Amino acid sequence: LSEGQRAIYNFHKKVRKDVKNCRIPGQPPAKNLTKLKWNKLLANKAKQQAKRCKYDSNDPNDFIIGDFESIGQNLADYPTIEGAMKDWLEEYKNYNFEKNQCNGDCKNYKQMVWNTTEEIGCGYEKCGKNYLIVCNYAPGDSEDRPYEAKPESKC
Numbered sequence: 433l434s435e436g437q438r439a440i441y442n443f444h445k446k447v448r449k450d451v452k453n454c455r456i457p458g459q460p461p462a463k464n465l466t467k468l469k470w471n472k473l474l475a476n477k478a479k480q481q482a483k484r485c486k487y488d489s490n491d492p493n494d495f496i497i498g499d500f501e502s503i504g505q506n507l508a509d510y511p512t513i514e515g516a517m518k519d520w521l522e523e524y525k526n527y528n529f530e531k532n533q534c535n536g537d538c539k540n541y542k543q544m545v546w547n548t549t550e551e552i553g554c555g556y557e558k559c560g561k562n563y564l565i566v567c568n569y570a571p572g573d574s575e576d577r578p579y580e581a582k583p584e585s586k587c
């Protein structure tokens with residue numbers, strides 16, 4: 433993994449560890465989340481997409497990757513990788529787990545804490561001032577809640 437790739441991978445590991453341990457503010461802790469494994473095919477497809485330097489593109493070809501049945505995707509148009517990661521994460525401020533409802537945009541946060549997601553790979557390209565960052569996830573998420581809650585005492 434590149435420098436950026438490794439940082440994006442660890443930031444996702446850390447978010448998922450945090451949500452299991454009451455460390456995402458105002459969000460119930462998660463009972464279980466599959467461990468993410470990096471996947472080279474997701475990462476390369478992410479990278480071919482990000483090299484176009486088009487944020488909206490999307491393009492259902494970008495969602496057909498090897499044999500995966502379902503692919504989710506988070507996109508960021510941002511001057512730094514860490515800023516992008518933090519922007520996706522803090523969408524947790526908009527998300528109500530009990531009602532499964534969102535005020536504004538929750539899609540990036542929900543995909544990061546999606547309990548059945550197993551494979552991740554991410555790709556980014558410098559496109560002028562900013563990066564286009566593409567993360568692909570397998571399986572992708574749905575409109576449901578991201579995980580099963582567990583009692584905050586188990587933290």
Ligand SMILES: *[C@@H]1O[C@H](CO)[C@@H](O)[C@H](O)[C@H]1NC(C)=O
Nearest residue numbers: 464465547548577578579580
């Ligand atoms: C993920 O969450 C769903 C409920 O939203 C739960 O029924 C399912 O068993 C969970 N699966 C895993 C692998 O954690």
